[PDB]
Design a protein around this nucleic acid. Sequence first.
RNA 1: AGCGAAACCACAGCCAAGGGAACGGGCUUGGCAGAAUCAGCGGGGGCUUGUGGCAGUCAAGCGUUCAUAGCGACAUUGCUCGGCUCUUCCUAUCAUACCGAAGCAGAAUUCGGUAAGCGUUGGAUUGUUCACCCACUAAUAGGGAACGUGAGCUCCCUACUGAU
RNA 2: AGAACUGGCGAUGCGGGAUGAACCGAACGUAGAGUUAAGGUGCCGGAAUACACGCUCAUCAGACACCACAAAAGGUGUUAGUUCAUCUAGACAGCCGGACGGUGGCCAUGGAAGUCGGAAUCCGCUAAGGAGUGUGUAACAACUCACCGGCCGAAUGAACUA
Lengths: 190, 73, 179, 27, 232
Amino acid sequence: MKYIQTEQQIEVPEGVTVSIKSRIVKVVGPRGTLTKNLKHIDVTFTKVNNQLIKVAVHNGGRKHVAALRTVKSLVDNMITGVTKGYKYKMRYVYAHFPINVNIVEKDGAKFIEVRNFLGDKKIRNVPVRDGVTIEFSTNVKDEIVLSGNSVEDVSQNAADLQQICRVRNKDIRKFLDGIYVSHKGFITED
Amino acid sequence: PQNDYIERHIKQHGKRLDHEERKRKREARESHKISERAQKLTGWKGKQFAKKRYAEKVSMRKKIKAHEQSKVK
Amino acid sequence: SLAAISRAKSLVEQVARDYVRLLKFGQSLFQCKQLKRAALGRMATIVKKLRDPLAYLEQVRQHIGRLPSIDPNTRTLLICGYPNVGKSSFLRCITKSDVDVQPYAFTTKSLYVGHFDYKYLRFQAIDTPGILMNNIEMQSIYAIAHLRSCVLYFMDLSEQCGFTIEAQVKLFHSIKPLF
Amino acid sequence: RQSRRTSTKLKEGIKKKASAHRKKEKK
Amino acid sequence: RSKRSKLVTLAQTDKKGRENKERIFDEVREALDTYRYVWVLHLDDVRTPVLQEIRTSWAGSKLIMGKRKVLQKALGEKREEEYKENLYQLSKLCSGVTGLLFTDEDVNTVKEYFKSYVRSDYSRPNTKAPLTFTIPEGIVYSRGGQIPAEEDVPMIHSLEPTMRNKFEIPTKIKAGKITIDSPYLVCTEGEKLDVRQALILKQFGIAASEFKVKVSAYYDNDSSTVESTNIN
RNA sequence: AGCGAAACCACAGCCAAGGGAACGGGCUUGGCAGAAUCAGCGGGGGCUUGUGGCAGUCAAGCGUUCAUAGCGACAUUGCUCGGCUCUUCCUAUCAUACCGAAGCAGAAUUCGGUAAGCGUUGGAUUGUUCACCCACUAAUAGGGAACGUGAGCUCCCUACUGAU
RNA sequence: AGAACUGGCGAUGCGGGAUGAACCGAACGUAGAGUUAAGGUGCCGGAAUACACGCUCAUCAGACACCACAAAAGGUGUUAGUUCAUCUAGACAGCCGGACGGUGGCCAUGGAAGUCGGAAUCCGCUAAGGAGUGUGUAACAACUCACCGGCCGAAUGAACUA
């Protein structure tokens, strides 16, 4: 409707400290650091009390007003990602052939191997994004854990671990094989 | 190859780990994909879609009216 | 459903032979074009009347599609009796065919076939639903009646099944005429 | 791709379609 | 354009709105003069067959519910806004659940009844539960490993998808049986419960939560006295 | 190496589109274009599409007043003288490519999507061809380029291939 | 299609419409100076990359020309309106709680408890609960919205019009 002054609020907890010059956003805290460019979006950040940040948008169109709310979230997720961390648990299932997932340190880049999946001699090598760590679930059969700071690194790498395990030209119902994200959560549960 | 071969598979192994998620999310995306398709889909693909969408709209007009007229009786 | 389609097949041929014979005498474009629209119009109306049989033929396309292929000449052996005697626990271990063991009435509504080999020779064991006339009842009755087979009737000498042993005796004498 | 030039036979075969819409309304 | 189009419903019930609020507004004001004693109940969470049991206990005394703000304005909010004398003092004290009761009976017969009345109900959100519920490391049952396995029926394979997502528990299914690898524990004695911690114990049908209905303020019509008592 | 015509001749001869009138060759808007010359070919001169019409329960609105001057959208009720080579382009795709859906177990099938990159056969009939059948293959898709290749069939100008 | 009337071209140049028989202006001696018509003023092009208010993003926008044909509609594109309704007696959205008692209504039947069906869709309790909107089960359960209520604190929703 052409608003005049559209602002949100970004609540900053006591651990983390935000730095925003132009539209580049740093979140320095307990777990480490996160930097993000937001020049593409074009808004106005306003520190108010070291504890609340207001992004405003003047003379906005509906499409520019939208762009504002998604900025609160994408800074919120940069804050929650350091104080609390992001952990994604993936359980993998099968019918006959047990999937023999391992991690290789080839060229120091860290990949995830996918072997024998639905009886494959094709070994599916999946990259691991930096920031995100991999560990196998102890005392739980056939399960792998993806834990990192950023929501992107984590969930995208979860997605690349899942999408490699389609069943080519078969049934959805009959064939159960693959890797699926079981549980979405936090590193520090509180 | 029995008589309910896939239904047993369900009643013994389950659908998927993720079959409720892909389903539910596809139900939501539809509202967008419909609008994307009614904006795209040039030519005869679209001229059928708009005519499909109208028969979907008169059917709904009937269903709403014939329910709220027989609310009294 | 075999005869309405057979009448429809000879109707779409009847539209093509008639309207084409009318079209070669269409002088202007607007006569020529309309008679095409008339041709497909009459064709469509035949197809639109067929929405009743072709939905049933879809249900039969899937049901005949999953139906077992039994052979009447092969060495067949029917497995029968009251619902949940232990006939499902019988076919489970004698041959590798998944039959559900669940403590209620009509567990298996259909014919379950179990292939096995003895003395280097081919045999097959056919499970029946269960008898008390209903459609599920009539399938089990005509299973022994028309197939060249030996009937394996099963009874229980305990509190299990739910049905009395006395009911199994009166079952045998009443359905005696066929087996 | 389609064009955006009006050929004159059309540009004036619009006027002669528009004139036919004038005499149609009156009757 | 672009908005969330609401789920199209063809239900046989119509929206009450203001035609119900007016019917309650007059019913509170008509019951103030007919009866003598009034109570206000903080009934935290209430099963319907429990409410009808309080109803069928006595037909003489009236139970009043609805909106809190309906119950403030029909009675009185301030010293100016009032129907009866010192009627606003009882309305300021009740802030939780709406519950109210008009009575013509004795004071001691009411308060002794409600202190003794404690019922079996499910574990509730944000409230503690006095059990350490552990599930067996094999096939799970309808009770969840409290009664012997022979008495109980194995759980339905249809509900297991919900067990993984909302109830969280790491569940795999073999031959139509819900199975967990390790003996799971959900709750402990003397700990505040979350929503999922509550609903697990609601699904298994465990009634390990005491329900005692409490009452607060007390009023007499002809005397205009406001009495405050904290029972549980 | 010599000798040596004629026919013919308003004038020039690059594409693309537009120039209303089976008129483009000079005009308009573009692409473009370097002097000079030799050898080939047989080279040229807002139309329409997919669901019939007839009577009707329809039923949003418009009808001077407004359902009864009366029409009325999608639906549903009734009857019922052609075809053999060689170029190019189109997608409305027959195969091949990747997906989406299906009681699709597997193998195969059907429907649908993006795609024109690459492919698309052989035999008995010709009283006017105005019909088709089994043989293979991954599949043997439909069309346009008007008298397409009827000046390949029953000493006018220049594009092009190259050469100095 | 035919009839009547009045123009235009025919005997007719000139400015404009990129170009033109039918449109816009304007009917011509030879010149200079001024002013305009119709049409324009990003550049090709002489003339404001003027001012002012809005609207529009198009995967071949639009500048398409009595707004006439493909046009009746479709779209979770967008801007404005019109007419009904809730709204600090707390609405819209949202996790939370209830969502009941004759009753597992009645015929159908191995099995029907709201939910494979057929005809009624009653009555009581209340704040409100449909002899029931779906998931699911052999049948039950559990879930479900619809109807309330609590936690939050203001504008929101529906049908349309342009």
